[PDB]
Write a protein that binds this DNA or RNA. Structure first.
Ligand SMILES: [Mg+2]
Ligand SMILES: [Mg+2]
Ligand SMILES: [Mg+2]
Ligand SMILES: [Mg+2]
Ligand SMILES: [Mg+2]
Ligand SMILES: [Mg+2]
Ligand SMILES: [Mg+2]
Ligand SMILES: [Mg+2]
Ligand SMILES: [Mg+2]
Ligand SMILES: [Mg+2]
Ligand SMILES: [Mg+2]
Ligand SMILES: [Mg+2]
Ligand SMILES: [Mg+2]
Ligand SMILES: [Mg+2]
Ligand SMILES: [Mg+2]
Ligand SMILES: [Mg+2]
Ligand SMILES: [Mg+2]
Ligand SMILES: [Mg+2]
Ligand SMILES: [Mg+2]
Ligand SMILES: [Mg+2]
Ligand SMILES: [Mg+2]
Ligand SMILES: [Mg+2]
Ligand SMILES: [Mg+2]
Ligand SMILES: [Mg+2]
Ligand SMILES: [Mg+2]
Ligand SMILES: [Mg+2]
Ligand SMILES: [Mg+2]
Ligand SMILES: [Mg+2]
Ligand SMILES: [Mg+2]
Ligand SMILES: [Mg+2]
Ligand SMILES: [Mg+2]
Ligand SMILES: [Mg+2]
Ligand SMILES: [Mg+2]
Ligand SMILES: [Mg+2]
Ligand SMILES: [Mg+2]
Ligand SMILES: [Mg+2]
Ligand SMILES: [Mg+2]
Ligand SMILES: [Mg+2]
Ligand SMILES: [Mg+2]
Ligand SMILES: [Mg+2]
Ligand SMILES: [Mg+2]
Ligand SMILES: [Mg+2]
Ligand SMILES: [Mg+2]
Ligand SMILES: [Mg+2]
Ligand SMILES: [Mg+2]
Ligand SMILES: [Mg+2]
Ligand SMILES: [Mg+2]
Ligand SMILES: [Mg+2]
Ligand SMILES: [Mg+2]
Ligand SMILES: [Mg+2]
Ligand SMILES: [Mg+2]
Ligand SMILES: [Mg+2]
Ligand SMILES: [Mg+2]
Lengths: 122, 200, 131, 180
RNA sequence: ACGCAUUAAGUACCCCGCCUGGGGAGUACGGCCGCAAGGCUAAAACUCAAAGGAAUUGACGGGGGCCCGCACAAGCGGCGGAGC
RNA sequence: UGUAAACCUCUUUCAGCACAGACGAAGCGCAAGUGACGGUAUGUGCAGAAGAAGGACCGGCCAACUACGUGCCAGCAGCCGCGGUAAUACGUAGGGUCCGAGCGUUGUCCGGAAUUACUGGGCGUAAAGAGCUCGUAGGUGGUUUGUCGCGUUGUUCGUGAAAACUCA
RNA sequence: GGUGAUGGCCUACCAAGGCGACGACGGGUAGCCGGCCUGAGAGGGUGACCGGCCACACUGGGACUGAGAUACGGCCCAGACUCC
């Protein structure tokens, strides 16, 4: 690109491929569950995972992934959601923190307790 | 906060002596762990981290303020490595440990936290003092009456006082004169990898 | 279109050094003469000269090579060119090979080497980075 | 005393009628510590043989790079193979900063203050090729003056003149210490 | 890299077009041109973690040259019919 | 696991309990006195190791490994990818690693990204030269003879707030 | 004519021009800056606090007071909100 072309056109930088559209730039959004169901990951990995469809304060319909092993989520349960991709599920881009609001951390966890929100032993 | 766990674990995992008189190390040099025999793959980051940890626990310095060491050394116009070693040897803890008034750096830190010393006639009870040049370090009457300090002052017959450091008499007055030089200090390990890891 | 005589002359010099020539013939000009002044006094060109041709005065350049066949000039790149022109202040004079190179600077006195300009405190336009 | 640093042990496989045949090739750099660089890359049927061939190749292929004090002379544009590497002499204590292969070769050469930055196509073999090419592209001020028919004071700046004088005095002191 | 190698992709100079992972799609909307077929200018979302280039050896080819086997041809006698 | 632990000596910072206890005020008044903070900061004493440690990671990147429990389930996960009975990748255990009164997750922004290539990209096929011309504007100029110096650097004092960065 | 002060600030008449592809006017975005984060650098992002300016005061307007009005808790009118 010659100098005159540079002056004529200006150099345009990449437009960011923004991910995690739901929070619209927020580190957190609060939502209410609409359904609880299961889905089958892509061909390389087959399983039966648990995903929840939640209504957001930002009025966006996006599924979220259910961590841990056991959950107490039934339809119309206020929940908390964070940002994170998931490759096994193609239409999933969100997690659901445990130990906050009505979602508690699965019992019997002592390793990586902080990530799932569990208390100590006594 | 300081380290409260076992101290010999550090030498055992590090593969080199820290205090210097370890019977346990010479009994079993292999680092702790049910697999202290597994071969370790070559890693430049691994070795840089190894050197960083050894130096840090050797000087008892906390991770953040030792990053502060490294950035300050960069700030000074001299060479970063020797600037860092100067500023970390300037620690009052290391001063007392190497002047024969402290058996171990941890004990020097314990005594400084207790506050039994007078520096230039002003009471001080902080371990990480900045010992400038030409300064003078004292010891006060209750410290004198303290038993273990007496034992240390009669036991200071180990590795002799380095060049710029010296003790003048029974009262154990410590005074530094000139600029410590890397070659004469002969502090172990090489600043090369420390500076590389922090410049990462 | 010969739209950059300085660039063409430098290209001819470096190409002749690559092809292992001895004499390079170019149309003569005042700028060519003074640049030859600079390079010869620095010791990169063994000697220049200005002659007369069928139409216009020209010049032939005599180079040297290192005792082991070594090339005299390694790289030649222009800096201030038609369109993109570069100048420098008294303090920001360019550094080439950490001083091992010579940058031709146009200053009020004329064209002088980087060291001459730095010692005189004068500045101008850097012509070519010669190494 | 020589230095050997393992940089890249690789797995390769070749296919013939029966199927796939696995293989090994390795690269390693050797240096003395005063500015002698030796590289060797070879293939073999397993790691020990690969390393043996690599050390043999490194010994066979050597090179000497005149250093100033403890740092390179001027910045080097290392263009060769498939990567682009640039180098900049440094002040002391800062160290020798670069990528993996760059540091392998440089610490083998023995330098202790240098800056490098790989600029594309970082494959280790090409990177090392470019480092060696740049390192051999260095210039010695004395030989530059000799070629240009110009003397040391007029050719070389006073700063590196004094640096070379101090390095010479330090070398003389080290020789005296060793002899005594 | 295959290759170019003074009628350069070499070493420079001057200007102009153009590109920034693959689909989506040179397509949807829009503006312009055309009587049209359509042409010109030129998007986003969502999905994939790779698609592509020259080149190494295989493998194979209803691709070529040189070779061998009751492979073919010439002969006898056969099983696939029945019982066993 | 471990000098770790109990053990024998020690100092007991800081919190606990008391004493003294500032300056912050040549400041104000023709008045005798004027301090919320605070009866704190700060010194001196009293008995006591006595009141005091957790979090993430340990497949490669990536310094940290093994066994126990279920095996294409239950699940992990940053990318590669990890379980179809004997997992260093799931969970439990130990053990180890990093960090630390903070430790992780998430999200925004720079970097490596030379991955918008001025420094500092490419155009044959990997993405790209339009299909090829004349030619307006713009961009650019084959030589030397001549001045004004508006492109330019040349220096002198003359502006650049404080605050922030760099030196002491 | 008007302003503390020149001037389409306002009025009348004359001429048809002025701004425009070294991007007018249009659309979405958003207080500017000394600065903050990053980067060796150029550069990218960004405007927390402090500070230098700007504009705003339930939404839309206008005017008085004076050396000094966008007049936040000064005035009037209109809408909304709440209340007697
Ligand atoms: Mg860095
Ligand atoms: Mg001319
Ligand atoms: Mg250029
Ligand atoms: Mg090149
Ligand atoms: Mg080549
Ligand atoms: Mg590359
Ligand atoms: Mg890379
Ligand atoms: Mg050509
Ligand atoms: Mg090209
Ligand atoms: Mg794209
Ligand atoms: Mg298209
Ligand atoms: Mg259209
Ligand atoms: Mg079209
Ligand atoms: Mg190809
Ligand atoms: Mg082939
Ligand atoms: Mg037959
Ligand atoms: Mg038969
Ligand atoms: Mg039959
Ligand atoms: Mg007072
Ligand atoms: Mg007083
Ligand atoms: Mg006190
Ligand atoms: Mg007290
Ligand atoms: Mg974990
Ligand atoms: Mg590891
Ligand atoms: Mg590992
Ligand atoms: Mg199992
Ligand atoms: Mg795990
Ligand atoms: Mg551990
Ligand atoms: Mg970033
Ligand atoms: Mg580019
Ligand atoms: Mg293509
Ligand atoms: Mg084309
Ligand atoms: Mg076309
Ligand atoms: Mg002037
Ligand atoms: Mg002036
Ligand atoms: Mg000024
Ligand atoms: Mg000031
Ligand atoms: Mg700074
Ligand atoms: Mg008038
Ligand atoms: Mg007017
Ligand atoms: Mg009028
Ligand atoms: Mg505004
Ligand atoms: Mg600024
Ligand atoms: Mg930078
Ligand atoms: Mg920059
Ligand atoms: Mg701004
Ligand atoms: Mg202010
Ligand atoms: Mg402000
Ligand atoms: Mg003003
Ligand atoms: Mg208003
Ligand atoms: Mg008002
Ligand atoms: Mg108000
Ligand atoms: Mg009011």
């Amino acid at each position: 690109p010659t100098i005159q072309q540079l002056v004529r056109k200006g150099r345009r930088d990449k437009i960011a491929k923004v991910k995690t559209a739901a929070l619209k730039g927020s580190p957190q959004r609060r939502g209410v569950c609409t359904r609880v169901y299961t889905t089958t990951p892509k061909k390389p990995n087959s399983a039966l995972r648990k995903v929840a469809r939640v209504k957001l304060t930002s009025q966006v319909e996006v599924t979220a992934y259910i961590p841990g092993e056991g959950h107490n989520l039934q339809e119309h349960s206020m929940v908390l959601v964070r940002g994170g991709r998931v490759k096994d599920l193609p239409g999933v881009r969100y997690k659901i923190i445990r130990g906050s609001l009505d979602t508690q951390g699965v019992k019997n966890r002592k390793q990586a307790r902080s990530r799932y929100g569990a208390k100590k032993e006594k | 906060a300081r380290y409260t766990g076992p101290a010999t674990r550090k030498s055992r995992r590090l593969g080199v002596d820290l205090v210097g008189g370890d019977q346990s190390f010479e009994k079993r040099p292999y680092p702790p762990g049910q697999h202290g025999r597994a071969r370790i793959k070559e890693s430049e980051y691994r070795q840089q981290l190894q050197e960083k940890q050894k130096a840090r626990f050797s000087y008892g310095v906390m991770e953040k303020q030792f990053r502060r060491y490294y950035e300050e050394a960069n700030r000074q116009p001299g060479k970063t490595g020797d600037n860092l070693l100067r500023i970390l040897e300037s620690r009052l803890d290391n001063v007392v440990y190497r002047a024969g008034l402290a058996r171990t750096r941890r004990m020097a830190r314990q005594l400084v936290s207790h506050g039994h010393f007078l520096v230039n006639g002003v009471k001080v009870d902080i371990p990480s003092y900045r010992v400038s040049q030409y300064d003078i370090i004292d010891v006060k009457e209750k410290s004198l009456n303290t038993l273990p300090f007496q034992i240390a002052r009669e036991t200071a017959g180990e590795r002799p006082i380095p060049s710029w450091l010296q003790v003048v008499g029974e009262r154990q007055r410590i005074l530094v004169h000139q600029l410590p030089e890397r070659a004469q200090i002969d502090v172990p390990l090489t600043e090369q990898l420390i500076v590389e890891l922090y410049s990462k | 279109t010969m739209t950059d005589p300085i660039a063409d002359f430098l290209t001819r010099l470096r190409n002749a050094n690559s092809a292992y020539h001895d004499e390079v013939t170019l149309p003569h000009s005042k700028l060519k003469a003074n640049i030859a002044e600079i390079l010869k006094r620095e010791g990169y060109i063994s000697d220049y000269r200005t002659e007369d041709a069928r139409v216009g005065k020209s010049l032939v350049v005599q180079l040297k090579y290192g005792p082991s066949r070594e090339r005299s000039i390694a790289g030649l790149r222009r800096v201030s060119k038609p369109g993109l022109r570069v100048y420098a202040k008294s303090t920001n004079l360019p550094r080439v090979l950490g001083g091992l190179g010579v940058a031709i600077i146009s200053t009020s006195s004329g064209l002088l080497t980087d060291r001459q300009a730095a010692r005189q405190g004068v500045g101008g336009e850097v012509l070519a980075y010669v190494w | 005393n020589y230095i050997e640093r393992v940089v890249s042990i690789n797995r390769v496989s070749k296919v013939v009628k029966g199927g796939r045949r696995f293989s090994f090739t390795a690269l390693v750099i050797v240096g003395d510590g005063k500015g002698m660089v030796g590289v060797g890359y070879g293939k073999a049927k397993e790691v020990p043989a690969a390393i043996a061939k690599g050390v043999e190749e490194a010994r066979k292929n050597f090179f000497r790079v005149p250093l100033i004090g403890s740092t390179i002379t001027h910045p080097v544009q290392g263009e060769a193979a498939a990567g682009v590497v640039m180098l900049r002499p440094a002040s002391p204590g800062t160290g020798v900063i670069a990528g993996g292969a760059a540091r392998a070769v440089l610490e083998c050469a023995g330098v202790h203050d240098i800056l490098a930055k790989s600029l594309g196509s970082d494959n280790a073999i090409n990177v090392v090729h470019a480092t060696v090419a740049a390192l051999k592209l260095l210039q010695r001020p004395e030989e530059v003056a000799a070629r240009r028919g110009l003397p040391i004071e007029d050719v070389a700046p006073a700063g590196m003149l004094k640096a070379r004088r101090e390095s010479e005095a330090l070398a003389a002191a080290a020789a005296r210490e060793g002899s005594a």
